[PDB]
Amino acid sequence: MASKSGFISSQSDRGKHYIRRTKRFSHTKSVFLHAR
Amino acid sequence: SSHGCKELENALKAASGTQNNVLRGEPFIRGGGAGFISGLSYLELDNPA
Amino acid sequence: CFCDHYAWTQWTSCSKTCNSGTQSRHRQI
Amino acid sequence: FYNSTWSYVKHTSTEHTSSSRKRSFRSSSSSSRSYTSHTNEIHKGKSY
Amino acid sequence: EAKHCVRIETKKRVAKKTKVEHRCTTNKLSEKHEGSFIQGAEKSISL
């Protein structure tokens, strides 16, 4: 977000930044071997 | 003068993978020398014959 | 077409017990 | 034996743009949107 | 590819008032349907 006013003189500014990041990873491996 | 911005991004990259690999087999033999029985009944995966 | 996308129904029960019946199945078109 | 293989891409990109200005004073508003939906699918079945 | 892009303008004077707007909405889509299916069998019988 950004906001401005400008106009004797007056200047006003507001800024905001937000970031959220998520990484989730899962790996599953299974081996069953039987010989008889 | 006045100005204002609002800006947004949202991204979702889901993914998945799976693999099932199954192998089975049963040679069976009657008759013949026990050495040749064991030597043949052992399953060679590259030549099941 | 990749016809496996329109998977087969399972085989209809064998038309007769003996002397060569037939079993058949449509796709899920 | 049989070897089924399937490879499916769906790509969509959608864009919106709306610029407006009014004067008598001055005012203006710009909006922009970009959307994407993507799916990649691979499926395989091998039987012996 | 599909496009709808439009530009409007207007001035009116009596005092003056004006409006001008531009919109351009667009879509692009692609699909690729690659596939393969190989099958086979072998009987052998010997006597």
Side-chain angles (χ1 to χ4, degrees):
Chain A
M1 302 85 177
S3 61
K4 308 286 186 172
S5 62
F7 178 20
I8 62 173
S9 182
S10 179
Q11 174 74 30
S12 305
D13 174 301
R14 208 287 197 287
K16 181 178 179 180
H17 315 142
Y18 170 96
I19 300 94
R20 182 70 167 210
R21 286 164 56 114
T22 286
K23 181 169 195 285
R24 298 321 181 61
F25 155 40
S26 75
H27 184 326
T28 55
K29 174 180 298 193
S30 177
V31 175
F32 178 97
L33 176 166
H34 162 287
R36 193 179 160 124
Chain B
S1 182
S2 176
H3 155 271
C5 301
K6 298 181 68 178
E7 304 173 41
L8 170 65
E9 167 277 342
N10 189 309
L12 169 56
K13 179 182 174 183
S16 292
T18 68
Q19 182 166 13
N20 282 21
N21 184 314
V22 172
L23 190 153
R24 298 177 173 253
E26 296 105 286
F28 172 93
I29 295 169
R30 273 167 52 88
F36 301 107
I37 294 192
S38 284
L40 181 64
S41 67
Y42 178 75
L43 183 67
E44 285 181 5
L45 301 183
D46 56 320
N47 183 357
Chain C
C1 190
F2 183 69
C3 302
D4 191 22
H5 222 304
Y6 303 95
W8 38 81
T9 53
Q10 205 55 26
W11 296 97
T12 305
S13 300
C14 188
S15 65
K16 59 180 62 184
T17 72
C18 55
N19 272 298
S20 187
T22 55
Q23 55 191 259
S24 64
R25 49 75 151 182
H26 71 86
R27 280 188 144 80
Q28 286 77 277
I29 290 148
Chain D
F1 57 72
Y2 70 90
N3 313 353
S4 84
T5 88
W6 182 236
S7 176
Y8 175 92
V9 175
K10 186 174 257 181
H11 173 31
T12 77
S13 177
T14 309
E15 298 181 36
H16 155 292
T17 63
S18 306
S19 296
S20 68
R21 184 176 299 106
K22 174 170 62 178
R23 307 173 58 134
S24 307
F25 64 85
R26 295 150 295 138
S27 66
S28 176
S29 184
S30 176
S31 180
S32 180
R33 194 180 299 100
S34 178
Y35 174 62
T36 287
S37 189
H38 193 323
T39 291
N40 199 323
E41 265 280 347
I42 302 176
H43 177 299
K44 312 187 185 187
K46 274 222 170 178
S47 176
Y48 203 113
Chain E
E1 175 175 305
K3 298 167 58 76
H4 172 304
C5 306
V6 60
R7 190 182 183 87
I8 91 165
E9 192 263 15
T10 283
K11 65 182 181 182
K12 60 180 293 184
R13 192 192 297 167
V14 191
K16 192 179 68 181
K17 193 179 184 178
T18 86
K19 297 193 301 181
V20 62
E21 303 99 293
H22 183 77
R23 301 196 64 238
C24 176
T25 183
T26 290
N27 158 25
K28 298 186 180 180
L29 175 153
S30 177
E31 278 217 50
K32 185 153 176 140
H33 296 276
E34 189 23 78
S36 180
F37 184 100
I38 298 171
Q39 171 166 238
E42 330 170 45
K43 286 185 179 77
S44 188
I45 296 183
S46 321
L47 188 164

